[PDB]
Every structure is written in C-alpha cells, then in structure tokens.
C-alpha cells in the first residue's frame, strides 16, 4: 500500500549496479521522447541475476517509484500455483494491464519458478507458461512501451530462449553486498534500532562475510531480540540498548547463505601491506593499470594488452595479496578462484562451471581473475596422463575466447610452475610469468607491520630488527610469528585475569617484545633452500638473454 | 480433544533446542506489541528439521499451547491424499483459517511429502502444491500475524525455494535426544508405568543409544508387555512390577532407527580419563576454550582464532578421548566423523555429504568437529594420483568457507601424518599439528583407572605398578589389558557358578589381583618402536626452530 514509498535512499548494497539500473531503465522511462527520436533501440528486459535475499524486488520497486513507472509484480510461485490454463491467463492479463499504464515495470520475481532450465521443465503446461512468456516478451518488445525485468538466482537456471535478443538481453549482477554495501544496508536497517552508541555499525559491517541484505536484516533482528531477552523485565521498552555485545552474539549465531557465491569486490591491500617487490610492482602496473587507465596509448602503438600473467614462487610469499594490491590500484573487481574450487570442478567432472566464472568476470569487468593455485590439479594427478587437465583446458578455451578488450586480466598463480600445462604459458594465454621471491627486508618489514596492524603492539618492539633477522622466512611464516605472539599475549593476558579474579577479586595492554622473543623461538622457515632453488632454476629457464645483451645497432 | 493439554513439562529430549524455540516463537506471539514497535522483523517460518519420531508435533503443540496460539495442523500425507485441485484448496483453507485466529501456529508435518526435493517432484500437481505453499508463505510472511513451522527429516529433502528468505528462513535441529534427554523422555513415558524400584531409569537411559522419543516409547512399551507376559495369570493387573530385567529384555530386543544419524552431544570424558598430556592440554585449551570463553581478548589483540588443529601420533593413544575432553571443558557439541564415513563418501562419489556435516556443525555450534582418521582415503589409495582426494578437498572447501566466528573447531586426527594432503596443513586450514605420544606414567595410570572404572576392581592391585611396567603400551593396549582381566574374571566367576550349581546346589566378587597377572601375560604392545619413531621424525620435521632460540633483542 503506502509503505511500498521505496526509493533510491532506501536501497543499499549496490551502487555501481543500481547506477547501471538507473542508466538502463530510467532515461528510456522518465523521458522516452528524448530516446526514440534518435532511433536507439530500447531495452525490453533487465534480467537481474543475483543470490536470493538481495532485495531485488525492493531494487526494482525503488527504480520504478523514483521514475514513476507503474511497478507491476508477477510472483513466480503465484503463477505456477494457479491451475493449468489460468497461469497463462494471468501472465497475458499481467502484460495487458501493464501496457495500459504505458510506462511500466513488470518484475517477474523467481523466474526460476515459471521458467527454469528447459531440461527441468516436465509437464506441457509447464512448457506452455515458458512459451507464453516468450511470446509475450516478443510482442511487448516490439510494442507498447513496457519494460519487463526479472530476478533470477543464476543465469544457467533460466530457459536459454529467454536470454535471446529482444527478450532478456540485458543482465545485472546484484551479487553479494560488499563491505561498504553492508555498511549501507546496516544503516538502512538500523535507522530505527536505536543502538547504545557502543555499536560501530562499521566493525560489524566488516566482520559480516557472506551476508546478503536479508541476512543483514536477520542479523539486526537477532541482535535486537538479544537486547530484548537481555532486558527481561512500557517505558522500559523504549529504553532498550542494542549494545555491541548483542551484535557479536548475533554474528556468532547468524547462519549466512551468501557463502559459496564468490564475491566480486575491490580489495583493500593498497600495496603497503605488500612492501618491496618493486620490479614486480612495475610489471603489474604495466600489465593491469596501463591497459585500463591509459588505453589510448595501447591503440596508438597497436599493442594488444596481454590477456594474462602467471605468478610463481615459494608458497605463501605474498602472491594473493599481490594481485589484490594491483586490483586495488586498478579499482577492478577481484575474483579469486582458489585451488579447491578448481579441484572440485576437476572431480565432479563439472568442467563447464568455469565458463560461468569467466562469464561472471565479463559482467564484473574490469577484473583481476586470480586463479589461485593453478597447479592444484597437476599436484592432484602427479605422475597415463602428462598434460592438459579437464578444467585447465576449459580455462584455456575461455581464456582464448575473450578479446583483449573488456579489461579482464587473469593472474593465476602457481606454487609449482613446472607441473602446470605448458599450453598455458603460450603467447596469448598467461604468457608473462613473474617470479614472486621470498620477501626482501623492506617487503618483510611491511609484512610484519601489516600482520601486526589492528593488534596492540608495543613501542619498544623493533620490527625492522625482526625483518632483518629473518632471511628465508616466507610471508606465511611471518604471519605465524605474529599469530604466535598475539596468541601468547592472549595466554599471558588471560592468565593475568585468572590469577587476578581468583585471588585479588576474592594486564598486558600490548604485545611486549618479550613475547616476540619466545614467540620467535618457535620460528619455522617453512620453505626450504631446495624449493626456492628450483623456483630460481625455473626462473632462469625463462631467462635466455644469452649474448643478445648489448644489441646496439 | 482435551488430551492434546501438552506443555513444556511434557516435552523432553531437547532443552537447548526447545529454549531456542522459546526465544523464537514465544516472545513475538504472547506480546507482539512489545515486538513490532521496535521494528524487528518477526520469524515467519521455523523449519524444525530432525529425525523421524522425535515428537516434533508434540513440541510444536506444546509451544503453541503454553503460548495460546492456535496450533492448527496440516498433515502432509493428508494433503497429498486428497485429489488434485482440492489439496491446494485445503492449503489455502488452512492458511485463511489460521489468519483469522491471528496468533496461530501452522505445523505442516511431513513437509517432505508435499514438497520434496525439487528434482523428485514429478507430476505437475506435485509442483502446483509446492508453488501454492510458496505463494501462501510469501503472502502470510508479509501479513496476518501468523507463523508457519514445519517438521522435516533433513534440510536436503526440502525444495530449495522453501528455504529462501521470507519463507523458511529459520531452522531448528531437533536432533537425537542425548543421555539426559533420554532420561527426561524415559521419566515422561514412565510417569504411569509404576516400576518395581529396581529400574534405575538412568542406567537404561545410558545404554539406549540412537533412541528417539518414539523409540523410547516403544522401549517402555515392550518392557511393559514383558511384565505382562511374565505375570501371566483384576487386582493382579494393578500389581504389575516392571523390573529392570524387563527393561534389559526390551533393550536387547529394541530396534532403534536413529543410528546413522550422527549425534551432537557435550561428551563425558572430563580430562582425567585422559590423564597426562599437560602441554597438549594447554594447547587444546588455548585453541578451543580461550576463543569461545574469553573472546573479547582475541578481538582486542586482533588475533583471528585458529580454525582447526590436527592431532597425530600412534593409533589408540587417546586421540578421540582427547577431543571429547576438550569438547567437555568447552561445553561444545562434539561431532565425530569416523574414518568409515569419509571412506563411504569417497566410494559413493558423494563428496557433497560433507557439506551437510559442516552445516550441522554450524547449527550445533560451538563444535569440536573431530574428523577421526582423516587419512582414511590416503591409506585407501596408497600409491596415477598423489594428493587432493575427493572429499578431503571438500573438507578443505567448507573449512576455508566459514569464518573464525561461529566457533566451529576442527580437530581431525591422523594416525599417519605424512600421507595426508599437504593442503590441509596450510595456515587457515588445520595448521596446528599436535603430536599425541604414547601415554606417560600419569597418562597410563589414568587410562588404567578409567578403563577399570565401573568394574569391581580389588584394593590390593596397584594400577601405578601396571602403569609403571607398561612403557610402549598405547591406550588401546591398556584397554585389552583390562578387557582381558575383566574377561578372566567373567570366565572364573561363571566357572564358579557352574561348579556350584552342578554339585553344591545338587564367587569372585571383584577382579582380584591374581587375574592381572594372567591378563598381563597376554600383553600386546601393538604399536612398534618403528612406528612411533616415524611419528617423532615427523615431529622434528615440524620443529625447525634452528638458531632463533635465544632471540634477544
């Protein structure tokens, strides 16, 4: 009724995506007179594909309301609920009603329900509703000024005839709300929750991971009810204090759904967490930023931008936080495909779900498609074989497919660079290889400073001394130095509280440098001298300058 | 009629889960005025998923009755029983009836029947009743003060569109009744059974395993009929004496259904059944208790709590009773995933049934997810392969997926620590490894005392002498020392009864110390000196301190 009015301010979790919606379906609706005189063909379907509970209904209702177009809702399960032959009547009546109110927004939510994948559709009446929808979008694409968007979980779950042109051509990935998106969603949902000012709304927004807007509403709901069941007695009702302990309890008891849906997000590493690596930094800038931030020069000199690069080197030396950093300078959506995902695709024989990954990269462009641990499969069949894995081959196919445009950069990184498919290293594919060595003294002092950031560390601790002592230490070992110093600070502080409460009732404010000594006593240089030796042998396998130096004339 | 009134006292076998129901659907029903003034969004579906016959109908009816909400039941097979067209009419009639009695509890038991897995639904009417149920749950989520719970066997057997938000967002694992839960259920079902005071009601509650409340009712029933068929003649009917022999007979001929349904329970090991292992005990406290009992300290010093630990060591040295012990101090539910279960997933190619275990840990949080014998698969393909097994990779996937919140701790323990996936031991994954050695003198005297507990053992026998003579004996060797000493006492006692009855009619009160020589003659040190040698070699493989000792400045 009067509640649904929903506007742009009431929508959070999507800024670029909602702006994309506005540039798609507000100019040809608010002022279509300026539109068709040019001769430009209007969109006639905006297939909003995203995880469930992102409030896609609220998004489309806000876009319709702040345009004035008559938002008419077609509930999917409602259509499938009605008997055979009345669902087709309801669909045609819906489109006919919406062409009356000529600026209209038809929003067929749960398009999976009425029109799933064509192999799933079983009955003929369940194939006369998909067909009726198809002919409706054709006839209302060619006529009557109505624009029909729909909300789906994924773009394989829709009948492929709907993605054909004229029908649902456009797609908008509503996706997971990111950290600032979760901030906006918490502010909207906590407009009236009247916290006790202990809640940041920012720290919780950072430590909610895999939480769509419905999950954030559930989080605020359970936190408010923890406040209610903590008060436990009408004026005392208005004096409820939703304190940060309630939000931490709600987080500890929140079941999120948006995990296993990979998140595209500009990461926060800023090239100072990964210090050093200066020549690698220059190569990554020249490979990512220069194609996208200075693309005129590339088309001037005729150079095609490289499709991909391939890190390699010792494990846990700052390879993942070295593609996040360059995705942060590029301000590109960062898509990390971890090794277990590639392995899962290699074991289920579902080698066609990496088409979906590259497609998601295409929509989320510009990208840094960090195929982390690209040699997981080659380790998993160490040995009858020899090359060309199941899904490595599909990675090659969808890597050769996309053009040097669309600014999608694959930065797949391998611990073992020799067991990988040698067809990956062909030109056009991940031809540039970049050795990521063990941290240099600047690099590991930056690593030690970054791992100890947000942790209360002393002033008399000499972190450059630590970084100067540690030569062969990989980045992961330098984390485990700090995560055994923080852990021992935990032990000492808790033991302090324990012998205080049992005796003094009846503090270790910071990680003192005597914790960084007995924590450093358990220091394991995890990468051997024979691992980095082989990585150097592969590195100068890729160095065959050999006499063409001082090529003068 | 008047019989169904059922209350909280009449429900047993679930305290935390029933209290969760109290905090879910008792506050927003008795006093909803205190609720919606805050702006908190009410629950609108409580998917009570649990094994069949846990009295879920009785649970929902008791919660409604002690609330006053109009419990109205939608029997699943009743809906599927009516012909096509009026099953949907019965659904709409049910919802429109319950929105009249504005505080109401719809309880659609056997939601598997009306809405199974979406692939399983075959006819179109079986897909118009799920769709009708979906649109009804949407319309009654957004309106009419009414809340709709439904009992299922598992959360895979339900159509995935029901678990979407607005629809069945909440889930409650009613689960297996534990030992004290079985005590409560036994007392409820044995209120009027008028025992002979020989029945403990507690010992029988301990030795019924995998028994849901209906199985306990069947147990009391078969015991009562054994009393009836032991009496075998109206006043003699009132003088029936249900003696513990009847309960033992009924327990020996009870067919339980709740086996193969993994039980979550705070176990009973109390950390002195496994004596010794003091440094291991301190690491386990620092890893489990300190993250969950003192969690503000971790967020102060910025430490993310470690996701999991990996025991290793000689077989049967107290590794399972070393994770139950820490799950007991933590008061966390304990989920043991034995090696045959992982192997069963590796052979059936059902690598996606370990997603269900991690989900079960998430609902049953905080947990100790003891993947006992994590190297079952690697032993089962000892040898073209090399690493990264079918379901070990899925364990890595849903181990990396969940955050350091939710307090789910994985303690997967391996006899052979080198054949396991090296990707398990990466940081973030089961990074801590804890060698579990053969018992020391304190540890094996505690093992001997615990194995001989509840068994009548003499005073003159020195268990410190036994623990002092056994050096290379693993804990299992010490069990077969005591389970051959008990067995010799059995043999000698039964032989005494035999030679008494055949001659004296026509006692060995305890395990005397002259049986502990005959048992100890067959003393098998089952773990060799070259097995523990390899485990210590792996231990120093994990000890690479190497000169960073005496790190001063």
Curated annotation (Swiss-Prot), chains A, B:
Record annotation: effect of changing residue 117 to A: Does not affect methylation by VCPKMT
Chief location category: cytoplasm
GO molecular function list: ADP binding; ATP binding; ATP hydrolysis activity; BAT3 complex binding; deubiquitinase activator activity; identical protein binding; K48-linked polyubiquitin modification-dependent protein binding; lipid binding
Effect of residue 120 to L/Q/R: Abolishes methylation by VCPKMT
Catalytic activity annotation: ATP + H2O = ADP + phosphate + H(+)
Post-translational modification: Phosphorylated by tyrosine kinases in response to T-cell antigen receptor activation. Phosphorylated in mitotic cells. ISGylated.
Subcellular location as annotated: Cytoplasm, Cytosol; Endoplasmic reticulum; Nucleus; Cytoplasm, Stress granule
Effect of residue 3 to W: In IBMPFD1; increased ATPase activity; impaired autophagic function
GO biological process: aggresome assembly; ATP metabolic process; autophagosome maturation; autophagy; cellular response to arsenite ion; cellular response to heat; cellular response to misfolded protein; cytoplasm protein quality control
Binding-site list for ATP 1: 52-58, 153, 189
E.C. numbers: 3.6.4.6
Positions of modified residues (N6-acetyllysine): 297, 300, 459, 534
Leading EC class: hydrolase
Residues with N6-succinyllysine modification: 459
Chain positions with Phosphoserine modification: 257, 493, 550
Consequence the record notes for mutating residue 122 to A: Does not affect methylation by VCPKMT
Impact when changing residue 59 to F: In IBMPFD1; uncertain significance
Modified residues (N6,N6,N6-trimethyllysine): 120
Ligand binding (ATP 2): 316-321
Subunit and partners: Homohexamer. Forms a ring-shaped particle of 12.5 nm diameter, that displays 6-fold radial symmetry. Part of a ternary complex containing STX5A, NSFL1C and VCP. NSFL1C forms a homotrimer that binds to one end of a VCP homohexamer. The complex binds to membranes enriched in phosphatidylethanolamine-containing lipids and promotes Golgi membrane fusion. Binds to a heterodimer of NPLOC4 and UFD1, binding to this heterodimer inhibits Golgi-membrane fusion. Interaction with VCIP135 leads to dissociation of the complex via ATP hydrolysis by VCP.
Record text about domains: The PIM (PUB-interaction motif) motif mediates interaction with the PUB domain of RNF31.
Similarity field: Belongs to the AAA ATPase family.
Function: Necessary for the fragmentation of Golgi stacks during mitosis and for their reassembly after mitosis. Involved in the formation of the transitional endoplasmic reticulum (tER). The transfer of membranes from the endoplasmic reticulum to the Golgi apparatus occurs via 50-70 nm transition vesicles which derive from part-rough, part-smooth transitional elements of the endoplasmic reticulum (tER). Vesicle budding from the tER is an ATP-dependent process.
UniProt name for this protein: Transitional endoplasmic reticulum ATPase
Naturally occurring in which organism (per UniProt): Homo sapiens (Human)
């Amino acid at each position: 009724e009067s509640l649904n009015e929903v506007g742009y301010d009431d929508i959070g979790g999507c800024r670029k995506q909602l702006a994309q919606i506005k540039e798609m379906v507000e100019l040809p609706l608010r002022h279509p007179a300026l539109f068709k005189a040019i001769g430009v063909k209007p969109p006639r379907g905006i297939l909003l594909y995203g995880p469930p509970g992102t409030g896609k209904t609220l998004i489309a209702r806000a876009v319709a309301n702040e345009t004035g177009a008559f938002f008419f809702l077609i509930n999917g399960p409602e259509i499938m609920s009605k008997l055979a032959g009345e669902s087709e009547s309801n669909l045609r009546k819906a489109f006919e009603e919406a062409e009356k109110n000529a600026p209209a927004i038809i929003f067929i939510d749960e398009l999976d329900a009425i029109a799933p994948k064509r192999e799933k559709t079983h009955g003929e009446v369940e194939r006369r509703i998909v067909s009726q929808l198809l002919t409706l979008m054709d006839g209302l694409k060619q006529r009557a000024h109505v624009i029909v968007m729909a909300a789906t979980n994924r773009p394989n779950s829709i009948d492929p005839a709907l993605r054909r042109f004229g029908r649902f051509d456009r797609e908008v990935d509503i996706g997971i709300p990111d950290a600032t998106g979760r901030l906006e969603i918490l502010q909207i949902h906590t407009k009236n929750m009247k916290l006790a000012d202990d809640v940041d709304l920012e720290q919780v927004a950072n430590e909610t991971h895999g939480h769509v807007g419905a999950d954030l509403a559930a989080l605020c709901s359970e936190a408010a009810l923890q406040a209610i069941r903590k008060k436990m007695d009408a004026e005392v009702m208005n004096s409820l204090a939703v304190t940060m302990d309630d939000f931490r309890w709600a987080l500890s008891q929140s079941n999120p759904s948006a995990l296993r849906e990979t998140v595209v997000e500009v990461p926060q590493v800023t090239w100072e967490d990964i210090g050093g690596l200066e020549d690698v930094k220059r190569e990554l800038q020249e490979l990512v930023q220069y194609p996208v931030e200075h693309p005129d020069k590339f088309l001037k000199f005729g150079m095609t931008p490289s499709k991909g690069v391939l890190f390699y080197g010792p494990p846990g030396c700052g390879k993942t936080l070295l593609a996040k950093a360059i995705a942060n300078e590029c301000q590109a959506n960062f898509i990390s495909i971890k090794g277990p995902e590639l392995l899962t695709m290699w074991f289920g024989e579902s080698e066609a779900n990496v088409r979906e990954i590259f497609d998601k990269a295409r929509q989320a462009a510009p990208c840094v498609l960090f195929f982390d641990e690209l040699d997981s499969i080659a380790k998993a069949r160490g040995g009858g074989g020899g090359a060309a894995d199941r899904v490595i081959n599909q990675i090659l196919t969808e890597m050769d497919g996309m053009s040097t445009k669309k600014n999608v950069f694959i930065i797949g990184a391998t611990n073992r660079p020799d067991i990988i498919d040698p067809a990956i290293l062909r030109p056009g594919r991940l031809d540039q290889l970049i050795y990521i060595p063990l941290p240099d003294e600047k690099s590991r002092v930056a690593i030690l400073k970054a791992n100890l950031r947000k942790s209360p560390v002393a002033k008399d601790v000499d972190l450059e001394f630590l970084a100067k002592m540690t030569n062969g230490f990989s980045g992961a070992d330098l984390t485990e130095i700090c995560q055994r110093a923080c852990k021992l600070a935990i032990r000492e502080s808790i033991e302090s509280e324990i012998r205080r409460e049992r005796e003094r009732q009846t503090p270790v404010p910071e990680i003192r440098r005597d914790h960084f000594e007995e924590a450093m006593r358990f220091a394991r240089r995890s990468v051997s001298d024979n691992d980095i030796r082989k990585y150097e042998m592969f590195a100068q396998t890729l160095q065959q300058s050999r006499g063409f130096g001082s090529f003068r004339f």
